[PDB]
Paper text:
A key component in the generation of cellular energy is the F1Fo ATP synthase, a biological rotary motor that converts proton motive force (pmf) to adenosine tri-phosphate (ATP) in both oxidative phosphorylation and photophosphorylation. The enzyme is based on two rotary motors, termed F1 and Fo, that are coupled together by two stalks: a central rotor stalk and a peripheral stator stalk. The central stalk is comprised of subunits ε and γ and rotates during the enzyme’s catalytic cycle. E. coli and other related bacteria exploit an internal subunit, termed ε, that can sense the environment and inhibit the enzyme under certain conditions.
Here we present cryo-EM data showing E. coli F1Fo ATP synthase in different rotational and inhibited sub-states, observed following incubation with 10 mM MgATP. The three catalytic β subunits in the present study were identified as containing β1 (βDP); MgADP, β2 (βE); ADP and β3 (βTP); MgATP. Masked 3D classification focusing on the central rotor highlighted sub-states in which the εCTD adopted either a condensed down conformation or an extended half-up conformation. In this study we observed the εCTD in two conformations, a half-up and a down sub-state. Strikingly, the improved detail in this study shows that the transition of the εCTD to a down sub-state is associated with a substantial torsional flexing of the central stalk, as evident by rotation of the εNTD about the γ subunit. This flexing, in combination with bending in the peripheral stalk, mediates rotation in the Fo motor. When the εCTD is in the down conformation, the central stalk is no longer stabilized by the εCTH1:γ interaction, likely increasing its torsional freedom, and the εNTD rotates relative to the γ subunit. When the εCTD subunit is in the down conformation, εCTH1 can no longer bridge between the εNTD and the γ subunit, thereby enabling the complex to open up to an unclamped conformation and allow a greater degree of flexible coupling between the F1 and Fo motors.
Author numbering:
A (entry chain H): 3 to 136
B (entry chain N), F (entry chain O), G (entry chain S), H (entry chain P), J (entry chain I), K (entry chain M), ...: 3 to 79
C (entry chain a): 4 to 269
D (entry chain X), E (entry chain Y): 1 to 52
I (entry chain R): 3 to 78
């Protein structure tokens, strides 16, 4: 198959062989596969799904990152990553609770955009625990 | 004789151009509708709303042409 | 009955009228020219469908409860929420008229279009053989006069709101100075904005009509030209298709009426 | 087609159905809906003040 | 042409149209009917829990 | 006399073509309007305003052509 | 005779223009469907539902011309 | 016959082609307007002023045909 | 006489415009298929399936025009 | 009489075709101008210079056809 | 006689439209192929196969048109 | 009568199509020039030197068609 | 006699439309080739191979139209 | 001998469609050339070579249409 690496400055999040993956992006997520074109790619808040050889899956939430794809060995240089069992649905509710606080907190438009991104992050965490149940 | 015969051709041209105009027109918006939905699936019911708004605007003149086509063909003949 | 395909299609586009200057019913082939000659059948079904609408809605509205609603009460509160949502998204003024206007347009146009799905001879057959009327055809929105009557209604509302909310000084400004700004272009600007303003509602009425006239005509064609053993297989797909048309045309006439009054006033 | 007195007769029915819908149909229905939404609103209120 | 045959063909076409509507247009309606109430159904109960 | 047949044809041509031009012009412009929503969700009240301003320019000449076609068919013919 | 040789051309104009309009309009919409379905395959059933819905919108207006075109050619002759 | 009816046909060709040209040219130009306004939502007043500059040129050549068409119908015919 | 050659001309108009519509709508559709294929060689059969689905919709009107063109031409 | 009366149609064809050609060619060119303007909005007067450069070349043939059409109307017919 | 003249005109318009439709349809499909090959030339044998698979459907109708155009000119005469 | 008449009609169609050809072809070429100017404005004097070269080829055939148009009107009469 | 009048016009419509289809089809396919050559030079001969493969298929129907227009002109009339 | 007038009409349709096909064909090919030069200006003399090689194919059919239309206009008429 092909191998994917996933890291952040705080930690290596995943690395290994993958039959396939699905990954967040800018204009939404994309599927990625061995045969996919070598698309260097920006990332907005969301998840990646890690389906390893013989079809076994992991489900990672990402704050953000960049998905370089020159090779078949691809990498996500994530800004911050937590897995769907390293977080839990209560921790995703705490992320949502922080987002609800941030929505309340200030009037400034870039602050409001940060709060909106924190909401998108929190819902992406909830969605990754749903993917983890799936 | 031509007063009978030509009216059918005039209606034919009216409903032919109406069919090309209406069919070609919304296809681009329908395209941005499906690609945009594929890109931002969260926004689908919203974009769908906006889609309806621009689609009801694309229909005015071709419906003028086709309604008068049926007038020419059946009322005056 | 000895009607040819074309002849029966004819009698299916033939209309019955009542002469207001003589109270005579109108012959299958000899119309009076005088415009005072009401298209009675379409009026009858139009007003009776509007009466049914208002009776059905009043019977709930006089009793409706804010607990969990009954099965019928829910189907009315749904369309109320659906209409309110569409208005609120497009209109931001104070006027109490716009939301019920949207409602009455939606439900009445919907019920008038719904007549097109029935078997094309059922009511005309009964109206000739049981009642003996010299003609009938039942789809009200399939005649120009009702759809332009509704459009002229909306045009009078458009004028009223463009006069009320911004006055003659603003309306005259917008009609003369745009689009070319300079006073030098006023005679040309009057042409460009005037034909647009007057065509918008007239187009809305005929926009619905250009669908329901062809709709009925298509059913007439399929029932007239084809033999019965092949009528069904080509009629049924059109009926299924025309369901989406009736629903969209009702939604369109509502939405566009809100769009016009919003763009006119604010 | 042919202009006819139906163009005038239908305008009366439309205007009158809008006036009656404005008075009788719309205010009681929207009243019942908003009375429900409001009431589902007010319960969510009590939680914040009580917990503080 | 036999006009009664046209009425026969129209009858069969209506029957088959009804059969499509019943199986593909009505259930989305009874779905939405139940759904309308269901979407905010638990909302009323959620208000009393805060008082608790 | 035969002359009346040509007047319906003339209105047929002018109105059919105006249906072509207004249908495609609103299709293109209204697809760009829909497409504009992909990147951000804070522009539908603004863009919908601009859209009606420029769309007013798109259908005006088509509506003139149709108005003269209507005059020719009903009044002149 | 001289009368009927032109009604087959009124039909030809209605069905030619409606075939061009319906085919290219559906071509525009369907390619956008295959593109978005290439980006996110999980959506393919969802997009497929949106695809047939908007295709129902596009094809509705051009089809009429073919209906009357069959009337003209086999009933008016 | 040949004097009056052809003049209405000439008018029909002049203002039907002017409807095609004035409607499609602004549909294309205004879509690029709405694309820029989506990339740079701070620029819309500037871009709209530029759009009016370009739109004047787009409409100027069709307006010759529309004014002359009205001349042919009222003054000549 | 004059009647028959005008019938051949009417058939030529129907079947020619049908050629334009069926050719261009599949050029536009197949280009998107080929770019998706060049992007997803992994889903060529899947995309090709979808491609036939829509292809059946594109061809629907042009084949009516072709069947009538043959009728007008050879059967009347 | 037909010899001069059809020259109004000849001029109608000439300048209506010129109007569609010019209006659409200017629509495409100005679209690319407005997108260039949105990408670098400090740059507008330079690119607008290059627009006024090439637009002159776009309109030259249409303008000579409009001039000859007007000549065929006011001088010959 | 004149019958030949009209039959040659019918075969000429049928083959002419077939030439436009078939050549522009393959020019679009092929532009997509050449770009997908330029992006990664390892798939040239694979894409060039999908190319022929789609191009087969592009040329289905235009060769019916050509086959009958040839028939009209050489056997209807 | 109609011999000299038709010569004017042939010149009207010849110059009309040449005006569409030259206007559209320069519209497309100048739009790509403007977009290269917007991406790399300091490179404009070189691209302008390439535009003047390609534009001459674009206009060369549309200007021999106009020359024969004037020949048909003035010399053949 | 009357034969040459209509037979030259048939040949003229035949090779004129063939000139449209062949010039637009090679314009689109060639522009994709030249962009591919700018994007990845030193692959020019490979891309050129692919370009000749597709070009042979684009020129198929237009060359039949050319060959038969030559036949009608220098053989039938 | 009325025959002369139609030959000028047939040459007019050949050279009019040839001027459209060869002008829009070179307009699309050259716009892709200019985007290539804006990206890779050191490659311009290489792209000019490929552009002249492809342009020689774009003008193959149109120079046949102009060749025979100019023949028809002088030698045959």
């Amino acid at each position: 198959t092909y191998h994917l690496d996933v890291v952040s400055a705080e930690q290596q999040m995943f690395s290994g062989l993958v039959e396939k993956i699905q990954v967040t992006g800018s204009e939404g997520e994309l599927g990625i596969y061995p045969g996919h074109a070598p698309l260097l790619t920006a990332i907005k808040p969301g998840m990646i799904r890690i389906v390893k050889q013989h079809g076994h899956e992991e489900f990672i939430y990402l704050s953000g990152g960049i998905l370089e794809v020159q090779p078949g060995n691809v990498t996500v240089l994530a800004d911050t990553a937590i897995r769907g069992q390293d977080l839990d649905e209560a921790r995703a509710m705490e992320a949502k609770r922080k987002a609800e606080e941030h929505i309340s907190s200030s009037h400034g438009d870039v602050d409001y955009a940060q709060a909106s991104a924190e909401l998108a992050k929190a819902i992406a965490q909830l969605r990754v625990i749903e993917l983890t149940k799936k | 004789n031509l007063n009978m015969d030509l009216l059918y051709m005039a209606a034919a041209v009216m409903m032919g151009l109406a069919a090309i105009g209406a069919a070609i027109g919304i296809g681009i918006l329908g395209g941005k509708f499906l690609e945009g939905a594929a890109r931002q699936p969260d926004l689908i019911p919203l974009l769908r709303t906006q889609f309806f708004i621009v689609m009801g605007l694309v229909d005015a003149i071709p419906m003028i042409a086709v309604g008068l086509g049926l007038y020419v063909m059946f009322a005056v003949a | 009955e000895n009607m040819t395909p074309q002849d029966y299609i004819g009698h299916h586009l033939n209309n019955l009228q009542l002469d207001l200057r003589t109270f005579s019913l109108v012959d299958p082939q000899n119309p009076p020219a005088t415009f005072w000659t009401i298209n009675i059948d379409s009026m009858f079904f139009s007003v009776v469908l509007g009466l049914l609408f208002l009776v059905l809605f009043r019977s709930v509205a006089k009793k409706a409860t804010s607990g969990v609603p009954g099965k019928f009460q829910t189907a009315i509160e749904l369309v109320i929420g659906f209409v309110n949502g569409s208005v609120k998204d497009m209109y931001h003024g104070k006027s109490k008229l716009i939301a019920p206007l949207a409602l009455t347009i939606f439900v009445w146009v919907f019920l008038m279009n719904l007549m097109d799905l029935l078997p094309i001879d059922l009511l005309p057959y009964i109206a000739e053989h049981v009642l003996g009327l010299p003609a009938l055809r039942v789809v009200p929105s399939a005649d120009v006069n009702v759809t332009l009557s509704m459009a002229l209604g909306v045009f009078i509302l458009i004028l009223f709101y463009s006069i009320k909310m911004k006055g003659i000084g603003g309306f005259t400004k917008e009609l003369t100075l745009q689009p070319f700004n300079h006073w030098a272009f006023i005679p040309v600007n009057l042409i460009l904005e005037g034909v647009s303003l007057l065509s918008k509602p007239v187009s809305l009425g005929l926009r619905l009509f250009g669908n329901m006239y062809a709709g009925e005509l298509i059913f007439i064609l399929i029932a007239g030209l084809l033999p019965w053993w092949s009528q069904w297989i080509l009629n049924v797909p059109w009926a299924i298709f025309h369901i989406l048309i009736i629903t969209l045309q009702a939604f369109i006439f509502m939405v566009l009426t809100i769009v016009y009054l919003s763009m006119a006033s604010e | 087609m042919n202009l006819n007195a139906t163009i005038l007769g239908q305008a009366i029915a439309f205007v009158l159905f809008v006036l009656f819908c404005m008075k009788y149909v719309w205010p009681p229905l929207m009243a019942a809906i908003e009375k429900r939404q409001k009431e589902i609103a007010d319960g969510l209120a009590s939680a914040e003040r009580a917990h503080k």
